[PDB]
Protein backbone atom coordinates (compact mmCIF):
# COMPACT_ATOMS: atom_id res chain seq x y z
CA UNK A 1 0.00 0.00 0.00
CA UNK A 2 2.43 2.99 -1.07
CA UNK A 3 2.85 2.34 -4.92
CA UNK A 4 0.99 3.20 -7.93
CA UNK A 5 0.42 0.82 -10.94
CA UNK A 6 1.32 1.74 -14.42
CA UNK A 7 -0.37 0.30 -17.58
CA UNK A 8 1.45 0.87 -21.39
CA UNK A 9 -0.48 0.84 -24.46
CA UNK A 10 1.50 0.33 -27.63
CA UNK A 11 0.01 3.03 -30.13
CA UNK A 12 0.21 2.88 -33.56
CA UNK A 13 3.32 4.22 -33.68
CA UNK A 14 4.13 5.97 -30.13
CA UNK A 15 3.53 4.34 -27.17
CA UNK A 16 0.84 5.68 -24.52
CA UNK A 17 1.50 5.10 -20.74
CA UNK A 18 -1.68 5.78 -18.72
CA UNK A 19 -1.28 5.80 -14.47
CA UNK A 20 -3.81 4.07 -12.26
CA UNK A 21 -4.14 3.33 -8.57
CA UNK A 22 -3.57 -0.79 -8.00
CA UNK A 23 -4.55 -4.08 -9.79
CA UNK A 24 -7.51 -4.30 -7.32
CA UNK A 25 -9.15 -1.07 -7.94
CA UNK A 26 -8.56 -1.93 -11.56
CA UNK A 27 -9.78 -5.77 -12.03
CA UNK A 28 -12.96 -4.40 -10.12
CA UNK A 29 -13.77 -1.50 -12.60
CA UNK A 30 -13.11 -4.43 -15.58
CA UNK A 31 -15.49 -7.02 -13.56
CA UNK A 32 -18.11 -3.63 -13.46
CA UNK A 33 -17.34 -0.52 -15.90
CA UNK A 34 -18.57 2.55 -14.41
CA UNK A 35 -17.62 5.84 -15.19
CA UNK A 36 -19.12 7.03 -11.90
CA UNK A 37 -15.96 4.59 -10.48
CA UNK A 38 -12.87 5.61 -13.32
CA UNK A 39 -12.15 8.24 -11.12
CA UNK A 40 -11.30 5.88 -7.73
CA UNK A 41 -9.29 3.91 -10.51
CA UNK A 42 -7.04 6.93 -12.44
CA UNK A 43 -5.94 9.40 -10.44
CA UNK A 44 -4.30 11.36 -13.14
CA UNK A 45 -6.42 12.32 -16.16
CA UNK A 46 -3.74 12.42 -18.77
CA UNK A 47 -2.12 10.16 -21.25
CA UNK A 48 2.23 10.48 -20.79
CA UNK A 49 4.40 9.31 -23.09
CA UNK A 50 8.16 8.08 -23.14
CA UNK A 51 11.44 10.86 -23.23
CA UNK A 52 11.95 12.60 -26.52
CA UNK A 53 14.00 9.05 -27.65
CA UNK A 54 14.71 5.35 -25.48
CA UNK A 55 15.01 5.83 -22.20
CA UNK A 56 11.45 5.55 -19.54
CA UNK A 57 13.25 6.61 -16.96
CA UNK A 58 13.33 9.69 -18.37
CA UNK A 59 10.87 12.83 -18.27
CA UNK A 60 7.87 11.49 -19.58
CA UNK A 61 6.24 13.82 -21.55
CA UNK A 62 2.45 14.41 -22.66
CA UNK A 63 0.74 13.26 -26.15
CA UNK A 64 -0.94 16.22 -28.15
CA UNK A 65 -4.60 15.80 -28.78
CA UNK A 66 -3.15 14.98 -33.01
CA UNK A 67 -1.14 11.75 -31.61
CA UNK A 68 -4.59 10.87 -29.54
CA UNK A 69 -6.47 10.27 -32.70
CA UNK A 70 -4.03 8.22 -33.72
CA UNK A 71 -5.85 5.78 -31.94
CA UNK A 72 -9.36 7.08 -30.73
CA UNK A 73 -9.95 10.67 -30.75
CA UNK A 74 -11.26 11.67 -34.25
CA UNK A 75 -14.14 12.86 -32.37
CA UNK A 76 -13.93 10.70 -28.89
CA UNK A 77 -12.95 13.05 -25.73
CA UNK A 78 -10.40 12.09 -22.68
CA UNK A 79 -12.68 9.45 -20.66
CA UNK A 80 -13.55 7.18 -22.98
CA UNK A 81 -9.92 7.08 -24.54
CA UNK A 82 -8.71 6.03 -21.35
CA UNK A 83 -11.57 3.51 -21.26
CA UNK A 84 -10.42 1.61 -23.92
CA UNK A 85 -6.72 1.85 -22.84
CA UNK A 86 -7.81 0.26 -19.23
CA UNK A 87 -9.41 -2.46 -21.47
CA UNK A 88 -6.43 -4.41 -21.08
CA UNK A 89 -3.25 -2.40 -22.66
CA UNK A 90 -0.12 -4.17 -21.71
CA UNK A 91 1.19 -5.40 -18.13
CA UNK A 92 4.61 -4.80 -17.05
CA UNK A 93 6.92 -7.94 -15.45
CA UNK A 94 9.12 -5.50 -13.49
CA UNK A 95 11.27 -2.97 -13.09
CA UNK A 96 14.96 -4.82 -12.56
CA UNK A 97 17.77 -2.30 -12.69
CA UNK A 98 20.86 -3.03 -10.41
CA UNK A 99 19.23 -6.29 -9.06
CA UNK A 100 20.28 -9.76 -11.37
CA UNK A 101 18.90 -12.52 -12.53
CA UNK A 102 17.99 -15.72 -10.95
CA UNK A 103 15.02 -18.23 -10.00
CA UNK A 104 15.11 -20.63 -13.12
CA UNK A 105 16.10 -24.56 -12.92
CA UNK A 106 18.25 -24.42 -9.48
CA UNK A 107 21.54 -22.94 -9.21
CA UNK A 108 23.52 -26.11 -7.25
CA UNK A 109 20.88 -28.74 -6.95
CA UNK A 110 19.38 -30.07 -10.12
CA UNK A 111 20.63 -28.52 -13.91
Known sequence: ???VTK?????ENTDLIVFAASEELVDEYLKNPSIGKLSEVVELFEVFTPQDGRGAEGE??????????NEF???K???EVIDLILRNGKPNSTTSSLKTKGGN???????
Do not use: C, D, P, R
Not at 7 to 11: N, P
Not at 105 to 111: D, P, S
Open 1 to 3: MST
Open 7 to 11: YFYKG
Open 60 to 69: LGAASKAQVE
Open 73 to 75: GKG
Open 77 to 79: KIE
Open 105 to 111: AGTKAYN
